[PDB]
Structure 1
Amino acid sequence: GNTTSSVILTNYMDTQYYGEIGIGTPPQTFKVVFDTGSSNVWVPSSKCSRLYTACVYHKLFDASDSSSYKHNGTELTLRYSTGTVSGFLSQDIITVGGITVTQMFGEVTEMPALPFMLAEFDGVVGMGFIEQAIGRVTPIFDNIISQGVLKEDVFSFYYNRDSENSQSLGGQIVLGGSDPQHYEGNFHYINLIKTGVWQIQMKGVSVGSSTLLCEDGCLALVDTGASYISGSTSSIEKLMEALGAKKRLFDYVVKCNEGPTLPDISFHLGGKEYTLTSADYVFQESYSSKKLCTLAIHAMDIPPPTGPTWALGATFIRKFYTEFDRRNNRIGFALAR
């Protein structure tokens, strides 16, 4: 192939990065997260009961308004770390950054308020492998590859640190390459443990100068759909005791004045150390001892076969521009700019 294609992303509060796709003829536009942690495409359906408040608030796909729609109707349930969606399969034309593909996707009829009422996006575009696709449906990137239009069998993620001011650009996905404008230095590559999952070996997790965690190795899922860096409950409990952080319901907190005093956290991947300073992992919203500041690291127990794993989400990608290489089954990291 010859072409490169980009998807402009919106950065919502440093936690949600989403772009727009079109589905059907004429195109019905949806805000979607592009998720390397999963392999299914889904959007909410017009068939979703309005008793699900998430379906009242999000954009719904109406098959009755699309002349290119092809019925399927196979029921499917997608169980994610933060919640579950259920619905049925359909086929239609999807437009992603100027690229048009015929795609099988889920029409979601059951969409829980938690977490979906907290989502700025409507659906998900899974960027993982067919091996992880529920119902063994061909993932969108595999269908785009089949077209033979892309210069390379790769895709790259840039997630901006700036979520506020306009004219910044929230983030960017490049289909078929990388954007040198958003990284510096050279890519350092890490081969996948196996095909089918964007997961790599991690050799250790350091808090300051000492390797408190993951000595003897562990797994690291490079997950564009996750807002934070996550580890298993036991790993995070140990990590947080070392930081002096206090557990709450859905996160860990530190007194805001303590934020800048927190140690660096280093991830040992492919012989290189990937270091995040406290500015990279603390939501430093004030400097008061009277206020609590949340950390962009949390516990998430991912079940087998994928888990138990650490997940390197938006917290990590903000610092490290990421290239997902399908041709060589590897992931490249470079310093984002």
Structure 2
Amino acid sequence: NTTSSVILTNYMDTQYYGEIGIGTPPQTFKVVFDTGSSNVWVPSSKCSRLYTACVYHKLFDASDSSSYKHNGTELTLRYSTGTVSGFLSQDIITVGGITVTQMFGEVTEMPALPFMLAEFDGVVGMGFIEQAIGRVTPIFDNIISQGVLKEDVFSFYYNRDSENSQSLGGQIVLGGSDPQHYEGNFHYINLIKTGVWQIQMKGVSVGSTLLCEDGCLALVDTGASYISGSTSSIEKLMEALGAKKRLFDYVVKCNEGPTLPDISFHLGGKEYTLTSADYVFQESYSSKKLCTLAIHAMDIPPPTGPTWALGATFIRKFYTEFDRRNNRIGFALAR
């Protein structure tokens, strides 16, 4: 019956990661704790240096760990934004002072796009075994097995401040939540199914409901930067906002930013509202300058998709508790 936290760094409101240690002695890695996937991977020393992303990130060297256990089963992790490929290994992983023996992917194939843009080295998947490639037991499942934690829950706080380096970029409590980072009560929404951190959504509103009328899906994805929907969902949301489409993002003229309407997500009977301040990167107030929106198109395939994904844009405003004992997600106002 103990509780434990991981200190997160916030890079520019788009990348949130903490530090883990792998092996004896610990090799440390910057990792995204991702509720939208279920595998652990770091880049590997076996990764060809022709992968520039492998030049620019910390590499796990199995030859420097005395606690490593070979497996070498190939794995390929297909994310919506890009793919990593490699092989399975087993070592001791430390995460918030919790030591666990864990199967993880040693990534030998790490595309320059998008991975050169990653501040983090790898990913710690916080999803279920059902979504785990290779049917590899996820790290939290392993920590639960130990019987150390007070509750079968984990919580995410993502800070709104990335500039002020003398502040906490984010936090993950394993085994509970932290009351210093939320307020009011938790609102609990049960999952559609076990296997995925996905909840029923019954509306996306601009200002009047104009999307997700007959119901749709919402993946709560701590590993994502943005709120995402389907290409057609986003194109209709953006037409409503007067946002011009670009190659990788949507933008308004910076001056139009504060005048943008509130966007609401109807989740578990409550209306979860984001103001323009919650979703516009107000980098300027100029009419000559384009400001990027924290909402993009992301088409996730079956069986998970098509689905909306509530990423860091959403978690910033809403402190999120992931409840594995009751298969539900709690949202409270962050502070």
- Pairwise TM-score range, normalised by the shorter structure: over 0.9
Q: Secondary structure at the match of 1:308?
A: coil
Structure 1 residue 142, shift from structure 2 partner = 0.2
Q: Quote the Cα distance in structure 2 between the aligned partners of 1:73 and 1:294.
A: 42
Post-superposition offset of 1:140 = 0.2
Q: Which residues of structure 2 form unaligned runs of 5+? A: none
Give, in angstroms, the shift of residue 28 of structure 1: 0.3
TM superposition shift of 1:215 = 0.3
Instruction: Tell me the secondary structure at the aligned position of residue 64 of structure 1.
Output: helix
Q: Is 1:224 matched with 2:222?
A: yes
Work out the CA distance in 1 between the residues paired with 2:233 and 2:74. 36
Superposition pairs of residues 118-197 of structure 1, within 5 angstroms: 118-197=117-196
SS in structure 2 of the partner of residue 100 of structure 1: strand
Distance in 1, Cα, partners of 2:176 & 2:165: 26
CA–CA distance in structure 1, aligned partners of residues 74 and 299 of structure 2: 27
Question: SS of the counterpart of 1:305?
Answer: coil
Offset from partner CA, 1:118-175 (integer Å, 9 cap, x none): 0000000000000000000000000000000000000000000000012210000000
What residue ranges of structure 1 are gaps of 5+ in the alignment?
A: none
Rounded Cα–Cα distance in structure 2 between residues aligned with 1:321 and 1:182: 7
Whether 2:60 is the aligned partner of 1:61: answer yes
Mapped partners of 1:174, 1:107: distance in 2: 26
Q: CA deviation at 1:263?
A: 0.2
Task: Give distance in 2, aligned partners of 1:176 and 1:83.
Answer: 31
- Displacement, 1:287? 0.4
Q: Which whole-Å deviations, capped at 9, do the CAs of 1:16-54 have from their partners, x for residues lacking one?
A: 000000000000000000000000000000000000000
Output the CA distance in 1 between the equivalents of 2:62 and 2:249. Answer: 39
Paired with 2:285 and 2:66, the residues of 1 have a C-alpha distance of: 56
Alignment of 1:75-90 (within 5 A): 75-90=74-89
SS in 2 for 1:234: helix
Counterpart of 1:282 in structure 2 is 280
Distance 2:2 2:114 in 1: 36
In structure 1, C-alpha distance between the alignment counterparts of 2:180 and 2:147, rounded to whole Å: 25
What is residue 104 of structure 2 aligned with on the other side? 105
Mapped to 1, the partners of 2:284 and 2:61 lie a distance apart of: 45
Q: TM-score, normalised by structure 1?
A: 0.99
Deviation string for 1:217-274 (max 9, x for gaps)?
0000000000000000000000000000000000000000000000000000000000
2:155 partner SS:
strand
TM-score (norm 2): 1.00
Provide, for residues 196-216 of structure 1, a one-character-per-residue CA deviation record: whole Å limited to 9, x for no partner. Answer: 0000000100000x1010001
Distance (whole Å) between structure 1 residues aligned to residue 169 and residue 53 of structure 2: 24
Aligned partners of 1:100 and 1:115: how far apart in 2? 31
Q: Distance in 2 between matches of 1:21 and 1:138?
A: 17
Query: Take 2:259 and 2:64, find their aligned partners in 1: how far apart are those partners?
Result: 56
**Aligned residue in 2 for 1:296:** 294
User: CA RMSD of the aligned region, Å?
Assistant: 0.3
**Counterparts of 1:15 and 1:162, CA distance in 2:** 11
Question: 3-state DSSP class of the match of 1:179?
Answer: coil
Q: CA deviation at 1:14?
A: 0.2
Aligned-partner SS, 1:180: coil
Distance 2:199 2:87 in 1: 32
Q: In structure 1, how many angstroms separate the alpha carbons of the residues matched to 2:85 and 2:220?
A: 25
TM superposition shift of 1:281: 0.3
Runs (4 or more) in structure 1 with deviation over 4 Å come to none
Q: Distance in 1 between matches of 2:167 and 2:308?
A: 30
Structure 2 Cα separation of the partners of residues 23 and 257 of structure 1: 47
Q: Deviations over 1:182-205 (max 9, x none)?
A: 000000000000000000000100
Q: Deviations over 1:41-70 (max 9, x none)?
A: 000000000000000010000001101000
